[PDB]
Design a binder for this molecule. Structure first.
Ligand code: NA
Length: 330
């Protein structure tokens, strides 16, 4: 089997991407944030505290003939950005892009933090990291990909995120039309439950490539590119008037600037992030200070290849017995 679903930016900045997911019988379609940095499929629901719902589409298990309470199971998750959610668990049929999993754990939110409530466009998350990070207790649950894997034509999914445009998540096949050149594969450590890999270095604009190992995760649920402070300072030093603002919480730059590209290494290959991808617009409406898309990972404890980096590539998440990541230009 295979599945193919379009993923759409939630706003004009590509702050996140939503992908429609069918849950239950008859189908309830919710727009989920597919997150390769977490392992819970959780949704706004009929159980969510009413004051914490503001515009989201909710999953109502009582209206699904295939829903069953997973008795005793609870979940609670906290993300890198400080947001959180928790609740109880149902199993139900979940389909993405025509690919169906029966018996998927659907984590129903009883509580969500303010950032979720305030984002009316995201109805929940579908985690695509390794199932060892799943928060369900007392019986850890499998991700949608892990449940689908054995049925797929190939044990892979791919992320093809758009810049200010829709993209695609495919399951079970490589679309050889979706990228240019060849896919370069690189080793993955699953020791922290992430798609953790080591970039071979970077370049700023037309500058020389610096060969240096940068360990980090491929995380579709993180908007920005978080890299070591040395790399980040080297990037922003090429932008006149850029500075790190403690008040704003990262590097800002004059909105009048033209940003340089940023290149990262994948083995001997190179992925180029155009400068425009690094512009996250005014820090507040009408400001001439713009927020940068490349930020320091110092104090986060891991480097994160978030959407700013991943949307410059066709990314293969190879879930074979020995997982690997693939990157191609597109
Ligand atoms: Na922000």
């Amino acid at each position: 089997s295979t599945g193919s679903a379009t993923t759409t930016p939630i706003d004009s900045l590509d702050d996140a991407y939503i992908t429609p997911v069918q849950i239950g019988t008859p189908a309830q379609t919710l727009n989920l944030d597919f997150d390769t940095g977490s392992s819970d499929l959780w949704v706004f629901s009929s159980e969510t505290t009413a004051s914490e719902v503001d515009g989201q589409t909710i999953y109502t298990p009582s209206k699904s003939t295939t829903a069953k309470l997973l008795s005793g199971a609870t979940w609670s998750i906290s993300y890198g950005d400080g947001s959180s959610s928790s609740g109880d668990v149902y199993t139900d049929t979940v389909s993405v892009g025509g690919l169906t999993v029966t018996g998927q754990a659907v984590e129903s939110a009883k509580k969500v933090s303010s950032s979720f409530t305030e984002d009316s466009t995201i109805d929940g998350l579908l985690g695509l990291a390794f199932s060892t990070l799943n928060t369900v207790s007392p019986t850890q649950q499998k991700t949608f990909f892990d449940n689908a894997k054995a049925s797929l034509d190939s044990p892979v999914f791919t992320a093809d995120l758009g810049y200010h445009a829709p993209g695609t998540y495919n399951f079970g096949f490589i679309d050889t039309t979706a990228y240019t050149g060849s896919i370069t594969y690189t080793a993955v450590s699953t020791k922290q439950g992430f798609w953790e890999w080591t970039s071979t270095g970077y370049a700023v604009g037309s500058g020389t490539f610096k060969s240096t190992s940068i360990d980090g995760i491929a995380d579709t649920g993180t908007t920005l590119l978080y890299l070591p402070a040395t790399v980040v300072s080297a990037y922003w030093a090429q932008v006149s008037g850029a500075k790190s603002s403690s008040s704003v919480g990262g590097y800002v730059f004059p909105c009048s600037a033209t940003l340089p590209s940023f290149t990262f290494g994948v083995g001997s290959a190179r992925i180029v992030i155009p400068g425009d991808y690094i512009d996250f617009g005014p820090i507040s409406t009408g400001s001439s200070s713009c927020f940068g898309g490349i930020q320091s990972s110092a104090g986060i404890g891991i480097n994160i290849f978030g959407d700013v980096a991943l949307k410059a590539a066709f990314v293969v998440f190879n879930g074979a017995t020995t997982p690997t990541l693939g990157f191609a230009s597109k």
